[PDB]
Design brief:
Belongs to the transferrin family. One of its GO terms (biological process) is iron ion transport. One of its GO terms (molecular function) is serine-type endopeptidase activity. With 692 residues, the chain is of the alpha+beta class. Helices cover 30% and strands 18% of the residues. It is elongated. Strands 6, 7, 8, 9, 10, 11 and 12 form a 7-stranded mixed β-sheet that branches. Strands 19, 20, 21, 22, 23, 24 and 25 form a 7-stranded mixed β-sheet that branches. The chain folds into 4 domains: 178 residues, D-Maltodextrin-Binding Protein, domain 2; 161 residues, Periplasmic binding protein-like II (D-Maltodextrin-Binding Protein, domain 2); 189 residues, 3-Layer(aba) Sandwich (D-Maltodextrin-Binding Protein, domain 2), CATH 3.40.190.10; 163 residues, Periplasmic binding protein-like II (D-Maltodextrin-Binding Protein, domain 2, 3-Layer(aba) Sandwich). The structure holds 2-acetamido-2-deoxy-beta-D-glucopyranose (NAG) (2 copies) and fe (iii) ion (2 copies).
């Protein structure tokens, strides 16, 4: 037969353990998957237990998801709590500031007042309120903890888990008896959402920092809910049911975490899917997964949560938290000077070592304004910008699709020499973009090869998901065949970013030492426009999917690299969609499609600053730049197209095309959306979940 010992759940107190044991027997009784219980005293202790295989799983507030994701622990959210109603379920909630009706004070008039918080380091109880209130605190920055600043700001507080000895003021309102006063557990009555609300009901505090549902969970009579109002960020008060218009932040729901390593994801999800169906929202009078004995609240999971939702594998704690909240958490340990220096600075994302070296030279010359981050794929760079770890990169239109689905926006586009219509152009920055031509290049010798007989031959691609190299040729082919089976369009290929064991990687050669085969960065010698052309010129493939200028740039002594030095434009032809073949110089009547210019993308929070930096930087290191070619040229890398295309004339403005749909256009977006039905990336799955 088989075996599965169990999933080891960490409880953080005794009533938790109690509920965890009674869950255990109800799983055995109903014959479902087994869960066993571990006991600790704190979230941190559960995070520790899990990282050293003494437990599998624990539910955590967003604040502790952040902690859990740091080294040495490296934990990952695997399942989100779902709130709302089965009609309108949601994996987020709202941090609100609740007050009694009858006072005049607003969110900016809180000094000297008394406060009720759920707990130190918690989302709604601490991180959001304290980050919102920051400009009123007169905090000097480290080494003095921000706690000291809030201790002087409110006259008295209950902040469970605060240091009663260092910050006695933060524990003064706490209703705990003895050593239980101000503790991070239910021994302290004013702990967590309901505890903080009770601190307000009792009149112990003037303000409670809680979630939007607390007043509805704890007050059944709707006439008693009227005695309460919300503080809105626009310095007004509004009724408690108007939380959507009146909240301090919208935040990700609590999540079950697990090891990133041998995490047991499947068993945890298997247990949770089963537990939820059998003991969920009023399913069994035997046991309520999301209920707590009338002594207590929120044991193991949030009371009245309605289920779980599985977190896609690509999501780590930072992606889970979102750029806003993730960077806001980090900012609580930083001075306002440091925070404002990071806003001023542009962190570039480099894909691979070669782009990293060039970005490093730019950085040194940028007068503090540009710095560098790096990853081994473009998707990984996109993730770094979502975590606010990097800010910017230039992307092929195919990747702009992915970036946009993830919420990033185009800011400036690569502009290229204008079809015999502009000069060495003073007005490049405002000249609207013209697109580039996607072409199918073949050898002249290959007289019998046409568009019509291209299926089954050997193919060279820039990378998977790029415009000229992938989306256009494969999109045209998909339009005939109907087949999602992309690895059978051609006998063999180099298509970087594909499965190394597939036919799509067969012709890739990897680096100078034969490592990194089929890797979607410049280490693979066949990567990108230049590498897909090379793949053809060295007889690896029979067709290369590139742009017209690529052939021009790599023939007739235009590229003096060993592989390229003796190639002639006349040895190459284009495949036209009408089955004819033409010279490269006739691309205008023999191209597969027009591709949108590569664009620099970023987060919405960086757009204006990014524009100032890039415009200033290109004035110095651009084509007509003051310090180019003397010191450094941004748009030069000897046919390697590092960071930008080498034929970029300038970075230009978008003229209203400020979203990916407007920039790429409705036709191109339809095409890719179609292609993506055949298979989506982890990152796209990840972004779907995060945008819900
Ligand atoms: C912070 O400085 C302001 C002066 O701009 C003052 O109103 C206030 O008393 C100071 N202290 C705190 C903790 O708000
Ligand atoms: C794709 O299919 C056909 C070829 O069968 C092509 O002519 C046409 O452009 C595409 N389909 C439609 C209906 O637009
Ligand atoms: Fe929370
Ligand atoms: Fe491209």
């Amino acid at each position: 037969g088989r075996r599965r010992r169990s999933v080891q759940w960490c409880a953080v107190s005794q009533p938790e353990a109690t509920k965890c044991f009674q869950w255990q027997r109800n799983m055995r009784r109903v014959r479902g998957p087994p869960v066993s219980c571990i006991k600790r005293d704190s979230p941190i202790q559960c995070i520790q237990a899990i990282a050293e295989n003494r437990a599998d799983a624990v539910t955590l507030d967003g604040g502790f998801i952040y902690e859990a994701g740091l080294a040495p622990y490296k934990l990952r959210p695997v399942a989100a709590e779902v709130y709302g109603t089965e009609r309108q379920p949601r994996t987020h909630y709202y941090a609100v500031a609740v007050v009694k009706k009858g006072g005049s004070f607003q969110l900016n008039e809180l000094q000297g007042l008394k406060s009720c918080h759920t707990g130190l380091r918690r989302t709604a109880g601490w991180n959001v309120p304290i980050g919102t209130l920051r400009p009123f605190l007169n905090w000097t920055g480290p080494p003095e903890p921000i706690e000291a600043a809030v201790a002087r700001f409110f006259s008295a507080s209950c902040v469970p888990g605060a240091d009663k000895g260092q910050f006695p003021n933060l524990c003064r309102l706490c209703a705990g008896t003895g050593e239980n006063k101000c503790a991070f557990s239910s021994q302290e009555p004013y702990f967590s959402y309901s505890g903080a609300f009770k601190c307000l009901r009792d009149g112990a505090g003037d303000v409670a920092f809680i979630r939007e549902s607390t007043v509805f969970e704890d007050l059944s009579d709707e006439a008693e809910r009227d005695e309460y109002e919300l503080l809105c960020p626009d310095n007004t008060r509004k009724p408690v049911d108007k939380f959507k218009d009146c909240h301090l932040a919208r935040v990700p729901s609590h999540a079950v975490v697990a090891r990133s390593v041998n995490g047991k994801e499947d068993a945890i999800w298997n247990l949770l899917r089963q537990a939820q169906e059998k003991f969920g929202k009023d399913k069994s009078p035997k046991f309520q997964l999301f209920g707590s004995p009338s002594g207590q609240k929120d044991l193991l999971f949030k009371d009245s949560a309605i289920g779980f939702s599985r977190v896609p594998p690509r999501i780590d704690s930072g992606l889970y938290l979102g750029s806003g909240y993730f960077t806001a958490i980090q900012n609580l340990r930083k001075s306002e000077e440091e925070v404002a220096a990071r806003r001023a600075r542009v962190v570039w994302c480099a894909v691979g070592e070669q782009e990293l070296r060039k970005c490093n030279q730019w950085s040194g010359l940028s007068e503090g304004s540009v710095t560098c981050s790096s990853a081994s794929t473009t998707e990984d760079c996109i993730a770094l910008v979502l975590k606010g770890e990097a800010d910017a990169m230039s992307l092929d239109g195919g990747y702009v699709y992915t970036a946009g689905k993830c919420g990033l926006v185009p800011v400036l586009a690569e502009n290229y020499k204008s079809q015999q219509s502009s000069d060495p152009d003073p007005n490049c920055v405002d000249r609207p973009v013209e697109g580039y031509l996607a072409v199918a290049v073949v050898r002249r010798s290959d007289t019998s090869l046409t568009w019509n007989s291209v299926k089954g031959k050997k193919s060279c691609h820039t990378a998977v998901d790029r415009t000229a190299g992938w989306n256009i040729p494969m999109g045209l082919l998909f339009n005939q065949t109907g087949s999602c089976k992309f690895d059978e369009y051609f006998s063999q290929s180099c298509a970087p970013g594909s499965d190394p064991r597939s036919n799509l990687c067969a012709l890739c050669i990897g680096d100078e030492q034969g490592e990194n085969k089929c890797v979607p960065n410049s280490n693979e010698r066949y990567y990108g426009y230049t590498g897909a052309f090379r793949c053809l010129a060295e007889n690896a493939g029979d067709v290369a999917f590139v742009k017209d200028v690529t052939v021009l740039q790599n023939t007739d002594g235009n590229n003096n690299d060993a592989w390229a030095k003796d190639l002639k434009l006349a040895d190459f032809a284009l495949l036209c969609l009408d089955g004819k073949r033409k010279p490269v110089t006739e691309a205008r009547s023999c191209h597969l499609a027009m591709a949108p210019n590569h664009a620099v993308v970023s987060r919405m929070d960086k757009v204006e600053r990014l524009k100032q930096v890039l415009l200033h930087q290109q004035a110095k290191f651009g084509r007509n730049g003051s310090d180019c070619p003397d010191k450094f040229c941004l748009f030069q890398s000897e046919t390697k197209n590092l960071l930008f295309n080498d034929n970029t004339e300038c970075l230009a403005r978008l003229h209203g095309k400020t979203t990916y749909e407007k920039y790429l256009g409705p036709q191109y977006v339809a095409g890719i959306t179609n292609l993506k039905k055949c298979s989506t990336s982890p990152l796209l799955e990840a972004c779907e979940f995060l945008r819900k």
